[PDB]
């Protein structure tokens, strides 16, 4: 959860 | 990859790592004579073993952020699919810190740079963890002793977290060719700086993996101990990492 929005986050 | 080619990649790793320090150095050397006393040591001592896991478990997880950050700004980890970069961050983003702290330990007095001033491992003991904690100061002091430059860590935690022997990872050989591009760089580097006497003085392969292992096995009696302290206030990055 946490990781996949930190690597989406733009 | 040609010279002009390997030394853009030279510059472009140092610049992502500097980018995405969470400490300067310069901040971290000029603090060295600010040391904690005996009653703030005692203090911290005092402390209970669950709310001593929480504080480290949450400095742990913002030193981890800076490493999401370091490896989003790392030439081709953005180009690798989702599943590669989740593998590799989870694998590597521990190992990565593990080396950046050997710049927040002072190999003259044996202390390190923790909440705002510098203290001896004994400052830990409350949480239980002594052989995981001497072992990580051990390591810290054996880095510290290679005098690691700023671009050193750069392109070698840029090594750490680009391994291309990771379990899980479906594009192997795009991991392959990114590893040995840096490995190239960093090698350049060293010989570009007269530094290649310390290659063989680098830590053996599997001792980043021993203290991550143990930190994820400490870690685990912790939770056995106090699940709701874990499960209520462990930072959600630090939950997804290594408890599971
Ligand atoms: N090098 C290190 C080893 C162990 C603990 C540490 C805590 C810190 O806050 C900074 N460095 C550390
Ligand atoms: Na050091």
Redesign the interface.
Known sequence: ????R??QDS | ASLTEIEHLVQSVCKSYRETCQLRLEDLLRQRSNIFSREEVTGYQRKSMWEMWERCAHHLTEAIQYVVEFAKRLSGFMELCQNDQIVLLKAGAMEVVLVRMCRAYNADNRTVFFEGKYGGMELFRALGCSELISSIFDFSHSLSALHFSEDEIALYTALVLINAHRPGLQEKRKVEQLQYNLELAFHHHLCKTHRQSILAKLPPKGKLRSLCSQHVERLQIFQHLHPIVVQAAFPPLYKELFSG
């Open positions: 959860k946490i990781l996949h930190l690597l």
